[PDB]
Amino acid sequence: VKKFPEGFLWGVATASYQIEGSPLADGAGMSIWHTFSHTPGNVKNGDTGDVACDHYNRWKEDIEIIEKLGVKAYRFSISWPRILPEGTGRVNQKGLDFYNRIIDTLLEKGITPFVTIYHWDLPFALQLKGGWANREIADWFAEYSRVLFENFGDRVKNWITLNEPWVVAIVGHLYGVHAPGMRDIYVAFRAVHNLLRAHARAVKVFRETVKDGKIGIVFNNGYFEPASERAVRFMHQFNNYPLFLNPIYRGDYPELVLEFAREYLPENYKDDMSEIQEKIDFVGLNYYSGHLVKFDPAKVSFVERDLPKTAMGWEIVPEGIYWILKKVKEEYNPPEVYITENGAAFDDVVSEDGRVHDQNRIDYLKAHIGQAWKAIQEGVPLKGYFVWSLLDNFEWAEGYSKRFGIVYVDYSTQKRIVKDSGYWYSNVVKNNGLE
Ligand SMILES: O=C(O)c1c[n+]2c([nH]1)[C@H](O)[C@@H](O)[C@H](O)[C@H]2CO
């Protein structure tokens, strides 16, 4: 048996735009994912977040599902434009009411809330003012954060500033695959820098406002391996937590990041580094996949390997999660770590028996939970693990076509069907580990 520490946090994870629907209900401002997904060509099948899982009306049912599964922590995000429709200034009481009911319900049912302040749904009003490209976002984010702390900090004690700022900056502003859909390398690296400055301003306000809670930040990570026998060192420093943690902990960008991108960063960016080092309480790592990497005249390309893949076409590489856990301890030694996301998309079918027999997702989860256990044995301070996702949801530019839930969602009726994964996971949580 692989048993976890006493009081280890077993959780599930969602994001506001991915599950809620009703993006303009009760005075909410538009977000950039609303305008981006309503632009033809940007999202698979013309899918948008207009309805999604209808969690905006079905929130109680979904929480009752979390409770019924015995899952102990729920990671969810707040939609900035529900709270402040123009991004700054006016506060919308109905948006606060929405998350207040979610928060109180979780606490009643003994589920611990983990709130992601920013999970990609920037108010459109602020995008008009440049969004992450604008230095003033540090102030706009700080004021948004202050609102959340004041309203919810009496009850929510675990906070995440940003979800995957690498994706926000690079996929949003260089690849243009995500909102706001831009393809400018200089904008993209100014967004990296501003995401850091905004994160740090939010931490600073947190210390002044919620004197008994904890705050951290979440990164996407890949397990990169070299094709022959440096481009791997780069991918780690650039795609993984070092891009942000080197500034946070060491006061500058990683070495290979500066080699590639010094010219794209603002000229006096080092002026902001002392503020950027605002102390954080934990590091959240997301992990999904491994990649084989070769040098190639960003001077990097991926080499496809055989290996089982998910419906995303992501190579299943469970040892990556142990690696990334060991490497973060080794490189930055954060006091606490969480796996804030881990999961897989598979082509899920409801059998005639009414169940979803996702043995592939179970194999995926079990393999990665084992590897996280190992890192705990070898001393990594991992305090929690979060499955992405509770529900099948809007998977960004893939639309509804990728299913990550441990609960199946039938979109034509909004019926939730717990998958074999969910039941299996429920048992892991109950036992506090693998049997
Ligand atoms: O780092 C990643 O690969 C990654 C995967 N995911 C994410 N980041 C985001 O945090 C979620 O909003 C996604 O829906 C989820 C599944 O694609």
Swiss-Prot record:
Catalytic EC class: hydrolase
Active site: E164, E341
Gene name in the database record: bglA
EC number(s) given by UniProt: 3.2.1.21
UniProt keywords, alphabetically: Carbohydrate metabolism, Cellulose degradation, Glycosidase, Hydrolase, Polysaccharide degradation
Keyword Ubl conjugation carried by entry: no
Pathway linked to the protein: Glycan metabolism; cellulose degradation
NCBIfam families for the chain: BGL
Naturally occurring in which organism (per UniProt): Thermotoga maritima (strain ATCC 43589 / DSM 3109 / JCM 10099 / NBRC 100826 / MSB8)
GO function terms (MF aspect): beta-glucosidase activity
PANTHER family the record matches: GLYCOSYL HYDROLASE (PTHR10353), LP05116P (PTHR10353:SF36)
UniProt-listed GO biological process terms: cellulose catabolic process
Keyword check for Transferase: no
Name of the protein in question: Beta-glucosidase A
InterPro entries named in the record: Glyco_hydro_1, Glyco_hydro_1_AS, Glyco_hydro_1_beta-glucosidase, Glyco_hydro_1_N_CS, Glycoside_hydrolase_SF
Similarity annotation: Belongs to the glycosyl hydrolase 1 family.
Reactions accelerated catalytically: Hydrolysis of terminal, non-reducing beta-D-glucosyl residues with release of beta-D-glucose
Disulfide feature: none
Transmembrane segments: none
